[PDB]
Design a binder for this molecule. Structure first.
Ligand SMILES: [Cu+2]
Ligand SMILES: [Cu+2]
Ligand code: NA
Ligand code: NA
Lengths: 620, 620
């Protein structure tokens, strides 16, 4: 019934049938992206029309297509031929990754390079990576992957311990041609293994850890209905899943008395970029757009009870399409559970004699993805007191290189001869706001210091200032941790009992943004990542900060082009885009497998409620 | 047997008898502070000598004294008379709190001010607040408290809902004179109650929360020996308790294979200040030094199983002295337990076929204190991967005022006519470092951006730089979130297997520091709070960032005086002092009882280990 229900296996099969019947999905076609479209603005109206957007690749080299289908009515709504040299290539296909190592294994230049290093081609793994846009004219309009080599000494060996530096190859994966093989010189291949399950390296395992048992004897406090609608401790929301963005939260609302009050219409991580800061020509092109180029939902892990998710777990198993339009289930791909979260509020009062303690808890919605060497956990948290928080957890194996003899300003040493280039992991959260409805505005709040003098004779006063962002051209903002800068999203037409507009405050972690030179290719392609906060007027087709087709696309799409429209955002339907990330200078302790590091953001109510919203929490 | 064991009831009783026999504890004497002294530097100290430091107040007006006693030998080691106009007054005594309200209840100016407001004197509570040092020449050398009034409608009423604005009194608590009563005008006393246990205000309590059961069927993984020595998951440390600082951690070390490696010799929160930013003369003097003026350890809560501390809990019950030298047990004053902490490390490898997941845990050591309207939780965390973290949790009831007709730049409105002045909560962590031993140094690490050009032709490179702090005069540092600034504490004489100095990196939250004008009284007395990081050379008597006697000291004591010695800190026995805090613009949701907000810092290994230290964690 709900328009926001997860896509079903039947819907995906019906999309396949509709596309085949229309002549759009013959044997030479591949589905590079398939996802359900959100309803247009206007609750109700069309009783129910489930629409899907599909990107269709052609393996014979014909132009790809973008198609919109109505599964409800069994019709193709629109189909447009794409000019990829202009608007960008489709996302990378899983089947294209395998092509790279196979093609290189028969190329005379590649084999000569491996022979010069005394390496057996049967032991050389090739990491197939996205190409970006650089100086190579022949790559315009072609689907290119670039390959970096690692040695695997035996089938269970961690190849990341043995990078083959000085060597890179470029591959046209449609015409199956090796365009270039670049060899800048022989580097020793680091010889130490990185096998973190080898007892030779782990030593004897600890016997000291006693079990921690987390159970809920009466079951969890949340309910799941309609497959993906959650009700928990006055929160209401729908949990979506898209193969590009991963978990998407819809219709986040809070039950305040008898009113269901909207807070966020749609919350997602709409892009994530991993730029590398090593100027070696072997790696200076390396930038992963995990969301836009690879599609993070495609690589979601199946999460194991007691290991990945601990406690009383409710799972969702979202369905995605494979490259031929067949439904594929990601079994146990989303974990949901509640967690104790310490003290919520506490006071022991001398004058009244009342001692008061209440405990906090949070609802957790999580999934984990694996893209090559890296593994990323995405966690959304809802708290009893109205706080909403996102946290990304980065782990996996760091990307490696040789460590040069005379040292490096851009690479860390992890082991003898083994380096790890500096890099960042930068996320973009797209928050389609709906604070008490769709009439919203953003204010920037700074601390204000005051000088000692008349009206401040003891020099103790301090204050704050709020600046309303009224047009898109002024809504590209930077962090300022020194002045305690935050942003408030408020509804000027909905007031609390003190006659002030209701609002939520965005608290950033104030980590560095994109470090690359502003003239670089990556700064143009990931322009969103150069600023901490952007605000746009809502529009149906403005979904990603990097545009629809990121792979091998130059600049010209995404947030800088949206903002140029200079639309009114003062009491309007607005979208907040928040950039946040980690700057990773790898340490010895990150090797051979990295302990989790985290980054995120949170939103807290700011005069949204008329008093604390957790006065009705019982005393356990 | 350990020199770092908690003080026992017997030791405190023996101190009392020693002082009494020496003639130092007559009927006019009060103990304002009593605490054990740490052993002096000596990696070979064999003879046990337990020494206590005592501040003795005289209620008849004689000069106070600082006394040092040896319990082991039963003697007074030294006793010095204090000139408090010079070096500061002694901490506030719990018994002086009551004196303020009683003295005012018979002062004719106070009674006339209440009569004008139609307030029954029997219902007016007076908060006894520290005085600071301002323009009142008559206060130099006198023991002053200032009082602000709140109305309690009935014995169980929350008086904080009913501030009496426009009225302040000053009291000499030794001679028992009311020195000034200032009445700047009549403000309505806010009438709404703030009784968070009144069903009229809470509504029906939720019936939706199902229990979360956290148990350890085989017991916890840590051991406690000698009363307060902890061993847990390769960590080793001693848990101390001091009536001024609260929980203190001693001898933090990590068992790396065969060797026990020191990390931190002593960790404590050595001061905390709460400055108010309201320029009204009723409150513009208001600054709490909770540690230095009030002593946060003496107000520690007894923590209740299942409410304050959930799980398999091991308690410590520290013993302190009352004002007469009798031992007083703080039953269940310290909670210790381990907690699951999500994923530690995870990777699914395509090439090796190995799927690997490990879970993280942390050890928690906590206590909670109540000073007037505020309640603070102090949490130390030790993680499996070598991370050390501190977290402060602020809750309780906000301090209130009238909300002026026409608004305010310095006060938030919480309810009709009820305001909450802006303020900060600023902490100073004192970290006596011992990274692999006592030869340590601090480096400041900044990200370095590079310009596109020769050697960086694609404009992707970025780097970092480290600056050694060599002398105390250059070791007063500010945060810079934009450049990712952190500080590394290293041992230049202890190298890891890559021949680099072992180190730990301090990650700050980069919140604003003290906002008051640099010429203010509070900026001079809380100078530590104006900068994020200070580094000093260790000295036995440099214990607190604000000096030994904070109450009514005119300024400059502590860190500015220490730093002025300009000692060598490059490869020496050094102490790191980190300032961090919360800037609190109260929100409606903070009323009538405030949900917890948090701030803290963490330290992560930076080449301290030769590879990840958690490869030997089992799968469970
Ligand atoms: Cu990284
Ligand atoms: Cu506060
Ligand atoms: Na919106
Ligand atoms: Na030291």
């Amino acid at each position: 019934a709900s328009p926001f229900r997860l896509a079903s296996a039947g819907e995906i099969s019906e999309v396949q049938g509709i596309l085949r019947t229309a002549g759009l999905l013959g044997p030479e076609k591949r589905i590079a992206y398939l996802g359900v479209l959100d309803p247009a603005r206007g609750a109700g109206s069309e009783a129910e029309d489930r629409r899907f957007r599909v990107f269709i690749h052609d393996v014979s080299g014909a132009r790809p297509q973008e198609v919109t289908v109505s599964v409800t009515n069994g019709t193709v709504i629109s189909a447009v031929e794409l000019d990829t040299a202009a608007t960008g290539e489709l996302p990378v296909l899983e089947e294209e990754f395998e092509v790279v190592e196979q093609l290189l294994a028969t190329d005379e230049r590649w084999l000569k390079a491996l022979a010069a290093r005394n390496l057996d081609v049967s032991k050389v793994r090739v990491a197939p990576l996205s190409a970006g846009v650089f100086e190579y004219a022949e790559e315009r309009g072609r689907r290119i992957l670039r390959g970096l080599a690692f040695v695997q000494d035996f089938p269970e060996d961690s190849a990341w311990a043995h990078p083959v530096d000085g060597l890179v190859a470029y591959v046209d994966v449609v015409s199956k041609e090796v365009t270039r093989v670049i060899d800048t010189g022989v580097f020793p291949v680091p010889a130490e293994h990185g096998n973190y399950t080898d007892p030779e390296l782990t030593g004897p395992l600890r016997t000291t850890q006693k079990p921690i048992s987390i159970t809920q004897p009466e079951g969890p406090s949340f309910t799941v209905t309609g497959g993906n609608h959650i009700e928990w401790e006055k929160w209401s929301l729908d949990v979506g899943f898209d193969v590009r963005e991963g978990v998407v939260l819809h219709n986040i609302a809070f039950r305040d008395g008898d009113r269901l009050r909207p807070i966020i219409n749609r919350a997602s991580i709409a892009e994530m970029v991993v730029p590398y800061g090593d100027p070696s020509p072997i790696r200076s092109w390396q930038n992963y757009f995990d969301t836009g180029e690879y599609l993070v939902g495609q690589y979601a892990n199946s999460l194991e009870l007691g290991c990945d998710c601990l406690g009383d777990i409710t799972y969702l198993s979202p369905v995605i399409s494979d490259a031929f339009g067949n439904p594929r289930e990601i079994r146990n791909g989303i974990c949901m559970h509640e967690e104790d979260w310490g003290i919520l509020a506490k006071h022991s009062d001398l004058w009244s004699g009342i001692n008061y303690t209440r405990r906090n808890r949070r609802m957790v919605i999580s999934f984990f993805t694996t893209i090559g060497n890296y593994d990323y956990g995405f966690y959304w948290y809802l708290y009893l007191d109205g706080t909403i928080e996102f946290e990304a957890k980065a782990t996996g194996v760091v990307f490696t290189s040789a460590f040069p003899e005379g040292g490096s300003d851009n690479i860390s040493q992890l082991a003898p001869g083994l380096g790890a280039p500096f890099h960042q992991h930068i996320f973009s959260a797209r928050l389609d706001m709906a604070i008490d409805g769709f009439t919203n505005r953003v204010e920037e709040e700074d601390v204000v210091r005051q000088t000692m003098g008349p009206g401040n004779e003891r020099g103790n006063a301090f204050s704050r200032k709020r600046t309303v962002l009224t047009r898109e051209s002024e809504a590209v903002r930077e962090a300022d941790a020194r002045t305690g800068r935050t942003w408030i999203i408020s509804n000027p037409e909905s007031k609390n009992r003190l006659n002030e507009p209701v609002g939520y405050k965005l608290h950033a972690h104030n980590q560095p943004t994109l470090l690359a030179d502003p003239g670089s290719s990556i700064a143009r392609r990931a322009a969103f990542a150069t600023k901490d906060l952007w605000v746009t007027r809502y529009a149906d087709d403005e979904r990603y900060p990097t545009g629809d087709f990121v792979n091998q696309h130059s600049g010209g799409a995404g947030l800088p082009s949206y903002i140029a429209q200079d639309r009114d955002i003062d009491g309007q339907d607005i979208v907040v885009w928040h950039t946040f990330g980690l700057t990773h200078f790898p340490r010895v302790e990150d090797w051979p497998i990295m302990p989790v590091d985290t980054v995120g953001f949170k939103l807290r109510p700011e005069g949204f409620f008329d008093r604390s919203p957790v006065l009705d929490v019982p005393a356990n």
